Amino acid sequence: ARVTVQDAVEKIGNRFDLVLVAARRARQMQVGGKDPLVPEENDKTTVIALREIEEGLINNQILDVRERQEQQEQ
Template sequence: MARVTVEDCIVKIPNRFELVMSAAQRTRDISAGAELTVDRDNDKNPVVSLREIADETISIPELKESLIRGSQRMAPSRDEDDAEDNANEIEESADALADALNAQDDSATLDAAGAFAFQDEVEIDDED
């Protein structure tokens, strides 16, 4: 990388680790098709991202936020309405299952493990 570009970036983002992470995120954005804010001048994407940071042609707080969003492993939590709808669907499914079990033949009941246990005895003829 160009030393002048890195030295210019350290003024904007003093922590070198944050600088590397931010430049890497911007490089990924550029590779994904983000619009450049400086002339490429035959430079590769990492150098272009450092030049953008040094010239402050991109918003550094937005870049850091993009980095955080890109590093998250968990999906954002759903709002309460979605959770309530999901709970209602589960309750309706449980009610439908209970109705189906009640409508089953009296010869079949559920045992403690939740499996069907048949009350009728089946006779097997052992005729040879």
């Protein structure tokens, strides 16, 4: 659980953009067709995406490249 979202904020620094990035990641994990890249502690998708951003393995650019890779695969 993310009591504070400071780490994600410095990872991508806007305090306004990480809301959008984490919303996109949480949508991907919640609608379907995606699995978390961080161990799951029975958290909701929200703080899971926040933890993924904090660990530095999710941002806007790599999300775009994964979307492009999925489009190229199909």
